[PDB]
Write an enzyme that holds these catalytic residues in place. Structure first.
Site, mmCIF file in Angstrom:
data_model
loop_
_atom_site.group_PDB
_atom_site.id
_atom_site.type_symbol
_atom_site.label_atom_id
_atom_site.label_comp_id
_atom_site.label_asym_id
_atom_site.label_seq_id
_atom_site.Cartn_x
_atom_site.Cartn_y
_atom_site.Cartn_z
ATOM 1 N N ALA B 57 -6.909 1.941 -0.379
ATOM 2 C CA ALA B 57 -7.918 2.147 1.858
ATOM 3 C C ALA B 57 -7.370 2.923 2.463
ATOM 4 C CB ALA B 57 -7.950 0.883 2.053
ATOM 5 N N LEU B 59 -7.439 4.234 5.648
ATOM 6 C CA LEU B 59 -7.980 3.544 6.713
ATOM 7 C C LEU B 59 -7.887 4.194 7.490
ATOM 8 C CD1 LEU B 59 -4.197 1.373 6.721
ATOM 9 C CD2 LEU B 59 -6.506 0.899 5.703
ATOM 10 N N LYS B 60 -8.484 5.677 7.909
ATOM 11 C CA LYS B 60 -8.551 7.011 8.415
ATOM 12 C C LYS B 60 -10.204 6.696 9.073
ATOM 13 C CE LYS B 60 -5.078 8.807 10.791
ATOM 14 N NZ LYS B 60 -4.963 9.644 9.855
ATOM 15 N N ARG B 83 5.894 4.048 12.304
ATOM 16 C CA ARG B 83 6.532 4.031 13.808
ATOM 17 C C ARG B 83 5.320 3.055 13.988
ATOM 18 N NH1 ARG B 83 8.637 9.555 13.752
ATOM 19 N NH2 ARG B 83 7.966 10.764 11.481
ATOM 20 N N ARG B 89 -3.322 3.214 16.900
ATOM 21 C CA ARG B 89 -4.144 4.586 16.912
ATOM 22 C C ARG B 89 -5.493 3.482 14.988
ATOM 23 N NH1 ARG B 89 0.605 7.739 15.090
ATOM 24 N NH2 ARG B 89 0.045 8.012 13.400
ATOM 25 N N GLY B 123 14.136 7.076 10.436
ATOM 26 C CA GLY B 123 15.577 7.119 10.169
ATOM 27 C C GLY B 123 15.852 6.777 8.980
ATOM 28 N N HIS B 124 16.216 6.374 8.338
ATOM 29 C CA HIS B 124 16.492 4.760 6.877
ATOM 30 C C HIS B 124 17.764 4.671 7.788
ATOM 31 C CE1 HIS B 124 13.697 6.721 4.238
ATOM 32 N NE2 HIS B 124 14.383 8.649 5.067
ATOM 33 N N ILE B 126 21.701 3.762 6.923
ATOM 34 C CA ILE B 126 22.367 4.576 7.059
ATOM 35 C C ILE B 126 22.261 4.646 9.327
ATOM 36 C CG2 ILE B 126 21.741 7.383 6.891
ATOM 37 C CD1 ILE B 126 24.625 7.551 5.982
ATOM 38 N N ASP B 154 18.015 -1.875 5.720
ATOM 39 C CA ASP B 154 16.890 -2.708 4.916
ATOM 40 C C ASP B 154 16.270 -3.726 5.007
ATOM 41 O OD1 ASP B 154 16.365 0.036 5.211
ATOM 42 O OD2 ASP B 154 16.264 0.715 2.796
HETATM 43 C C1 LIG Z 1 8.762 5.708 -2.805
HETATM 44 C C2 LIG Z 1 9.955 6.357 -2.677
HETATM 45 C C3 LIG Z 1 11.503 5.895 -2.692
HETATM 46 C C4 LIG Z 1 11.665 5.278 -1.290
HETATM 47 C C5 LIG Z 1 13.569 5.557 -1.466
HETATM 48 C C6 LIG Z 1 13.929 5.465 0.141
HETATM 49 C C7 LIG Z 1 14.380 3.690 0.318
HETATM 50 C C8 LIG Z 1 14.851 3.872 1.556
HETATM 51 C C9 LIG Z 1 14.507 3.343 3.255
HETATM 52 C C10 LIG Z 1 14.873 2.994 3.744
HETATM 53 O O1 LIG Z 1 16.624 2.962 3.953
HETATM 54 S S1 LIG Z 1 14.377 1.809 5.573
HETATM 55 C C11 LIG Z 1 13.515 4.049 6.021
HETATM 56 C C12 LIG Z 1 11.597 3.863 6.619
HETATM 57 N N1 LIG Z 1 12.313 3.303 7.616
HETATM 58 C C13 LIG Z 1 11.478 2.559 8.741
HETATM 59 O O2 LIG Z 1 10.792 1.971 7.999
HETATM 60 C C14 LIG Z 1 11.396 2.376 10.226
HETATM 61 C C15 LIG Z 1 9.289 2.222 10.670
HETATM 62 N N2 LIG Z 1 8.943 3.763 9.678
HETATM 63 C C16 LIG Z 1 8.897 4.585 10.108
HETATM 64 O O3 LIG Z 1 10.017 5.645 10.633
HETATM 65 C C17 LIG Z 1 8.241 5.972 9.429
HETATM 66 O O4 LIG Z 1 7.247 5.244 8.512
HETATM 67 C C18 LIG Z 1 8.798 6.908 8.680
HETATM 68 C C19 LIG Z 1 9.735 7.675 9.375
HETATM 69 C C20 LIG Z 1 9.394 5.632 7.180
HETATM 70 C C21 LIG Z 1 7.933 7.743 7.687
HETATM 71 O O5 LIG Z 1 6.951 8.147 8.792
HETATM 72 P P1 LIG Z 1 5.892 9.096 8.463
HETATM 73 O O6 LIG Z 1 5.673 9.950 10.089
HETATM 74 O O7 LIG Z 1 6.724 9.562 6.844
HETATM 75 O O8 LIG Z 1 4.478 7.988 8.806
HETATM 76 P P2 LIG Z 1 4.437 7.048 10.531
HETATM 77 O O9 LIG Z 1 4.838 5.811 10.123
HETATM 78 O O10 LIG Z 1 4.852 8.314 11.329
HETATM 79 O O11 LIG Z 1 2.854 7.096 9.745
HETATM 80 C C22 LIG Z 1 2.542 6.922 9.000
HETATM 81 C C23 LIG Z 1 1.301 7.519 8.053
HETATM 82 O O12 LIG Z 1 0.710 7.853 7.623
HETATM 83 C C24 LIG Z 1 -1.283 6.886 7.608
HETATM 84 N N3 LIG Z 1 -1.120 6.292 6.807
HETATM 85 C C25 LIG Z 1 -0.750 4.662 6.427
HETATM 86 N N4 LIG Z 1 -0.974 4.020 5.594
HETATM 87 C C26 LIG Z 1 -2.396 4.547 5.322
HETATM 88 C C27 LIG Z 1 -3.964 4.758 4.296
HETATM 89 N N5 LIG Z 1 -3.585 3.251 3.827
HETATM 90 N N6 LIG Z 1 -5.086 5.477 4.783
HETATM 91 C C28 LIG Z 1 -4.516 6.109 5.747
HETATM 92 N N7 LIG Z 1 -2.975 6.378 5.872
HETATM 93 C C29 LIG Z 1 -2.565 5.627 5.550
HETATM 94 C C30 LIG Z 1 -0.625 6.837 9.338
HETATM 95 O O13 LIG Z 1 -2.262 6.799 9.184
HETATM 96 C C31 LIG Z 1 0.608 8.004 9.665
HETATM 97 O O14 LIG Z 1 -0.455 9.129 9.743
HETATM 98 P P3 LIG Z 1 -0.236 10.023 10.705
HETATM 99 O O15 LIG Z 1 0.304 10.266 11.752
HETATM 100 O O16 LIG Z 1 -0.818 11.370 10.148
HETATM 101 O O17 LIG Z 1 -1.666 9.114 10.932
#
Ligand SMILES: CCCCCCCCCC(=O)SCCNC(=O)CCNC(=O)[C@H](O)C(C)(C)COP(=O)(O)OP(=O)(O)OC[C@H]1O[C@@H](n2cnc3c(N)ncnc32)[C@H](O)[C@@H]1OP(=O)(O)O
Ligand SMILES: CCCCCCCCCC(=O)SCCNC(=O)CCNC(=O)[C@H](O)C(C)(C)COP(=O)(O)OP(=O)(O)OC[C@H]1O[C@@H](n2cnc3c(N)ncnc32)[C@H](O)[C@@H]1OP(=O)(O)O
EC number: 5.1.99.4
Lengths: 357, 357
Positions: B57, B59-60, B83, B89, B123-124, B126, B154
């Site tokens: 989906a 969502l935009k 975030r 938004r 962040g992650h 660590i 995590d």
């Molecule tokens: C998958 C690959 C392997 C995995 C390895 C990593 C595993 C380790 C994880 C850790 O150690 S915890 C790390 C994550 N930290 C957090 O989850 C804390 C909260 N999350 C964040 O700080 C941020 O989500 C993150 C830094 C992880 C990623 O930042 P982004 O800047 O990619 O996403 P942000 O949260 O600001 O916004 C998500 C975007 O997806 C978009 N979005 C999400 N679902 C959507 C949807 N279904 N349709 C359309 N747009 C969608 C949303 O609109 C938005 O885009 P826009 O800013 O362009 O509007």
């Protein structure tokens, strides 16, 4: 009592490690927690015993037993953290408790589980995580494994699964009218806690080599680095965009570096990042990367955490006793936890029964 | 659907790390979990996405937003890990969800929290454990801190607190008839996970020096040891009676050693235990100390876990897709979980609304 669990009634048979921790978090979230200890043990000075009423009772006497079964009859949850068989012999086993209260969530916290060849073996955190692959995976590659304190077996894979079990059973009870037994084994909880590695191993994205993985310290972009002042930063710039931002802030031209994920060249990349981080102190990097997505943060010692803006402003801690302690987690919009009550000097088990009638 | 959370309905806005792990566990215990990904990712080998229905989906878009708001209307729980400000938004914020379903548990999974100076930094794990004193405490004294994989921030301090908040809030909704917002931040959860150390610091029983405490590897009787074959055992013999049993098994007379807790003579004691453990192979020690309270266990690698008798018998693991995976935890006497269902192909979001009436 403030918090989402207001009016939950919990009897804790005093043990060590996970049980007390689970009981604490219940209390923190406003549950009514009564801890039965043995009279052999002023006010207890282990702040893990916050948000409790402490009563003593020789559970080997017939009176202490009877008094205990009176509590349990008035309660929603019983926690015990003894070896299997122990509560049964006290006459406090699941079946004895079901007689006085068929609604009870009976919560058993062990390391090895309820049955099986190791079920009577003494143990601590380090032992439960040695058997299931976890301990082997932690530390540098050229060295023996290092215990991640007791965070993974006792708390993360232990108390927290006991809590998830107590609370899922309470939900189930809403529709069935009935309690049941939660068998929370640290060797099991910690394995679920590390499910991501088992997943990654299946898709060939994790190896059993210590120090050679994305999240174990092997990746130059997911590790700590020593700075000019001998203190440390943590880097966690997994995402290529965050990684790029980090390089720019270090002053490093991406063109002169090996690729982020060319593992054969990781030793080379790490040497370059090591030299860059070493050229300024920790606080410099903290300032440089503030408001950044570079995933670089100062690594603070316990004694410095009270001076960190982001910690102060969210009140993650409150002052107590000798010093700082964590405020309840998680947080609730409508029914907010309140500051924990200090460890509450011995009360009399009769008084509690009056209170609960 | 088997397990205590049968009938619980869960909407998961696809993310990374804690949010999917929390969602996995709810599904593990019988919850009906529906995961909304963006179609921009349409293809799964990630066994963390077990016990799931996946739907696409944007969502935009207007349609995406509406279909999501329909599922949320018919669910008990929403999990998002973006975030702060993202769901707002997007028109899926708490206030917008509250207008279509005031019973909703609105579960917000972040690292830094919903507010404060770091609330928008990437962040992650660590990073989150670096700020609250945890990372600094992990590893040997003569080296830089080592990350305990992504286990502490995590999962243990992240997803698990998310789960406890969801389930605590569901309990509360039994009285109030109303949902609420759960704010689970890894920097807070992990701080509570290490509450023990904060307590012990207050009473002088824990120092900020890495590698010089009872549970961080500084104690000779709580650490790993290298064996003749270059593999390792874990020693956790904290209590003097278990320590004594270990010494007997090692062939060391107490009378020739320094006292177990004479910290000034830990160098000597470590040298003595080191030499003793080094004289036979891991599997020798494993045999000697099976069925003992000596708190000595083999440090197994992931790949060896499936041959350990105690792991086999309790079915801690199940096979799936060329690799073992952990069975659900904890365990329930009456409403037992079943084996997880693997990831499935995407399903149509309409067909989910249809199925959900
Ligand atoms: C998958 C690959 C392997 C995995 C390895 C990593 C595993 C380790 C994880 C850790 O150690 S915890 C790390 C994550 N930290 C957090 O989850 C804390 C909260 N999350 C964040 O700080 C941020 O989500 C993150 C830094 C992880 C990623 O930042 P982004 O800047 O990619 O996403 P942000 O949260 O600001 O916004 C998500 C975007 O997806 C978009 N979005 C999400 N679902 C959507 C949807 N279904 N349709 C359309 N747009 C969608 C949303 O609109 C938005 O885009 P826009 O800013 O362009 O509007
Ligand atoms: C703060 C600084 C100190 C450091 C903290 C310690 C480290 C952190 C903990 C970890 O890393 S997790 C470690 C603990 N492992 C577990 O909790 C797993 C399950 N528990 C056990 O395996 C055993 O409880 C344990 C090895 C920890 C200790 O074994 P014991 O043999 O001392 O106790 P056990 O559980 O077998 O039985 C307790 C006895 O107390 C008796 N008892 C309990 N409460 C009583 C009461 N109120 N009155 C009278 N008797 C009582 C109970 O009846 C029983 O008597 P028996 O001799 O008949 O079997």
């Amino acid at each position: 009592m403030a918090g989402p669990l207001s009016g939950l009634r919990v009897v804790e048979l005093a043990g060590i490690g996970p049980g007390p921790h689970a009981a604490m978090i219940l209390g923190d979230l406003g549950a009514d927690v009564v801890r039965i200890d043995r009279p052999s043990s002023g006010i207890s000075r282990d702040a893990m015993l916050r948000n409790r009423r402490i009563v003593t009772a020789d559970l080997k006497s017939d009176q202490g037993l009877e008094l205990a079964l009176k509590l349990i009859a008035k309660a929603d949850v019983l926690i015990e953290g003894y070896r299997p068989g122990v509560t049964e012999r006290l006459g406090l086993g699941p079946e004895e408790c079901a007689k006085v209260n068929d609604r009870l969530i009976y919560a058993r916290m062990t390391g090895w589980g309820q049955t099986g060849p190791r079920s009577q073996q003494a143990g601590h955190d380090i032992n439960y995580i040695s058997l299931n692959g976890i301990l082997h995976a932690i530390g540098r590659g050229d060295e023996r494994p290092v215990p991640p304190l007791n965070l993974v077996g006792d708390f993360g894979g232990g108390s927290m699964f006991l809590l998830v079990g107590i609370l899922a059973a309470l939900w189930e009870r809403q529709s069935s009218g009935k309690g049941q037994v939660v068998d929370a084994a640290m060797v099991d909880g910690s394995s679920v806690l590390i499910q991501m590695m088992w997943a990654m191993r299946a898709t060939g994205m994790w190896t059993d080599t210590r120090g050679a993985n994305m999240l174990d310290g092997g990746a130059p972009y997911y590790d700590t680095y020593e700075c000019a002042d001998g203190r440390y930063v943590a880097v966690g710039a997994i995402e290529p965009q965050f990684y790029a931002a980090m390089l720019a802030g270090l002053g490093l031209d991406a063109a002169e570096l090996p690729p982020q994920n060319d593992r054969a060249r990781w030793p080379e990349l790490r040497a370059l990042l090591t030299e860059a981080f070493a050229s300024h102190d920790r606080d410099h990097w903290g300032a440089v990367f503030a408001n950044s997505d570079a995933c670089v943060t100062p690594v603070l010692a316990f004694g410095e955490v009270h001076n960190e803006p982001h910690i102060i402003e969210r009140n993650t801690f409150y002052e107590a006793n000798g010093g700082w302690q964590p405020m309840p987690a998680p947080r609730f919009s409508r029914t907010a936890s309140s500051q924990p009550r200090p460890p509450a000097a011995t009360i009399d088990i009769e008084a509690v029964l009056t209170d609960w009638d």
